[PDB]
Amino acid sequence: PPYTVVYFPVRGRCAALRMLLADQGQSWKEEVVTVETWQEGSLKASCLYGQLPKFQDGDLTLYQSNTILRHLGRTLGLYGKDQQEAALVDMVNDGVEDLRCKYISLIYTNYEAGKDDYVKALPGQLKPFETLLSQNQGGKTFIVGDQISFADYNLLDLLLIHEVLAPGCLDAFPLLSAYVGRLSARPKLKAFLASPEYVNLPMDEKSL
Amino acid sequence: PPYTVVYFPVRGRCAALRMLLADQGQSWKEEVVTVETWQEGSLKASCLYGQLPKFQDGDLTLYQSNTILRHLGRTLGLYGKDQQEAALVDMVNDGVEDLRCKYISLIYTNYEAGKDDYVKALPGQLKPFETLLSQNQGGKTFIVGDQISFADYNLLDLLLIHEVLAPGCLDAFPLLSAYVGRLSARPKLKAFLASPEYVNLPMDEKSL
Numbered sequence: 001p002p003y004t005v006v007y008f009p010v011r012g013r014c015a016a017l018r019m020l021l022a023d024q025g026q027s028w029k030e031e032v033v034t035v036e037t038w039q040e041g042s043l044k045a046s047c048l049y050g051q052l053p054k055f056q057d058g059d060l061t062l063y064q065s066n067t068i069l070r071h072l073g074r075t076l077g078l079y080g081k082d083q084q085e086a087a088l089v090d091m092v093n094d095g096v097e098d099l100r101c102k103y104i105s106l107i108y109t110n111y112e113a114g115k116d117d118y119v120k121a122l123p124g125q126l127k128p129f130e131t132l133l134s135q136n137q138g139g140k141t142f143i144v145g146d147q148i149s150f151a152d153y154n155l156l157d158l159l160l161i162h163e164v165l166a167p168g169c170l171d172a173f174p175l176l177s178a179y180v181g182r183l184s185a186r187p188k189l190k191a192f193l194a195s196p197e198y199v200n201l202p203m204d205e206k207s208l
Numbered sequence: 209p210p211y212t213v214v215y216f217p218v219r220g221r222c223a224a225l226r227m228l229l230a231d232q233g234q235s236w237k238e239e240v241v242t243v244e245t246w247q248e249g250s251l252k253a254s255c256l257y258g259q260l261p262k263f264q265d266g267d268l269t270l271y272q273s274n275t276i277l278r279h280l281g282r283t284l285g286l287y288g289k290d291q292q293e294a295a296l297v298d299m300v301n302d303g304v305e306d307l308r309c310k311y312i313s314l315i316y317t318n319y320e321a322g323k324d325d326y327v328k329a330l331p332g333q334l335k336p337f338e339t340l341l342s343q344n345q346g347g348k349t350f351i352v353g354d355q356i357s358f359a360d361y362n363l364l365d366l367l368l369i370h371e372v373l374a375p376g377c378l379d380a381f382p383l384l385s386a387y388v389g390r391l392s393a394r395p396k397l398k399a400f401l402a403s404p405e406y407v408n409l410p411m412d413e414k415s416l
């Protein structure tokens with residue numbers, strides 16, 4: 001630290017890393033980039049891959065949402081207890097990223113027309129996470145091992161996103177359901193999720 | 209170890225991890241899955257996310273190509289010299305994954321019709337890697353730091369893939385060009401890239 005999140009005024013790909021920082025009692029600065037400023041071009045041209053989020057940690061500048069998640073996970077001890085758990089954490093996060101990309105494809109390229117088929121296929125896309133939970137201490141703890149990881153925050157975000165898209169989609173998955181309620185009940189995270197900082201921010205850039 | 213790669217008979221998403229194993233002097237078993245066997249359904253149903261590659265390391269079973277790359281990188285010391293370099297390695301790999309997904313979208317959903325526009329936009333997609341190279345010891349070493357990382361193998365694979373799609377696409381990028389020649393010249397990797405094991409395997413599953 002200090003930590004600075006440079007992003008558009010939406011939850012989007014920064015929701016999970018923000019949940020992580022809040023739940024971990026970290027402090028950080030939000031540098032909001034308006035659509036107007038982005039269209040100006042200078043900031044975009046200076047971004048490694050021409051996109052946001054951009055993350056500043058002291059003198060270190062990073063790009064890529066999952067890189068930020070892994071960085072915070074690595075430096076704050078949220079990346080498994082050993083190398084085997086670390087691999088499992090990656091396996092979960094890669095799965096979360098895959099579904100997030102499918103979600104992104106839906107809302108940005110075929111929402112109204114593809115929404116129905118997507119929701120029908122959703123159960124099959126959520127089952128893997130329910131299965132992982134069932135194979136780890138009966139799913140009473142975290143997605144991997146007995147300690148929270150950056151993948152828990154990313155998965156939580158994706159699940160919350162889908163509950164909005166398809167209310168009750170987690171009713172068919174007892175472990176995921178309890179898991180979401182459990183993580184959402186963690187004091188610092190609960191406070192964050194209920195604050196205007198989170199609540200009054202639109203879900204996706206599509207809303208911009 | 210022992211290591212086992214379970215995949216279709218193509219380079220696809222296993223090319224980079226294979227280059228890594230070969231260049232690192234590792235031994236591994238290839239369990240080829242034919243389209244027929246896949247259509248049978250049993251293997252697919254047993255895969256965490258219903259897809260390949262599946263990777264076995266001793267008693268550990270992993271899925272997700274980037275998870276395999278990170279696992280080998282972590283266990284073989286190809287993940288940066290410190291936490292800062294580790295983050296940079298992730299930043300590069302996430303960028304490689306992003307472009308690979310764009311490439312995948314092209315060949316599978318709009319090849320013939322989108323090929324021209326994709327190639328025109330390619331320079332802008334490759335510039336970030338040229339820039340990273342220019343900011344690290346003049347690009348005379350690796351993509352991050354002075355030691356090879358799993359991201360080098362993944363980037364190398366993506367660059368080779370694009371040279372086939374658009375011959376000479378690296379001519380406008382001196383650092384990337386030299387970088388590819390340099391990595392491709394590493395003894396063990398050079399031997400692997402020239403072997404039937406690599407050469408006679410189709411590039412993508414699309415060829416199946």
Ligand SMILES: N[C@@H](CCC(=O)N[C@@H](CS)C(=O)NCC(=O)O)C(=O)O
Binds near residue numbers: 044051306
């Ligand atoms: N793989 C990147 C994706 C970044 C991305 O898609 N950024 C979008 C917002 S969610 C953006 O900056 N769009 C504006 C543009 O492309 O110029 C990550 O995970 O951070």
Ligand SMILES: N[C@@H](CCC(=O)N[C@@H](CS)C(=O)NCC(=O)O)C(=O)O
Binds near residue numbers: 094
């Ligand atoms: N995110 C996964 C993607 C895996 C993937 O796309 N697998 C394809 C081949 S490259 C597959 O198994 N297709 C067969 C199927 O889905 O039934 C990874 O990086 O490993």
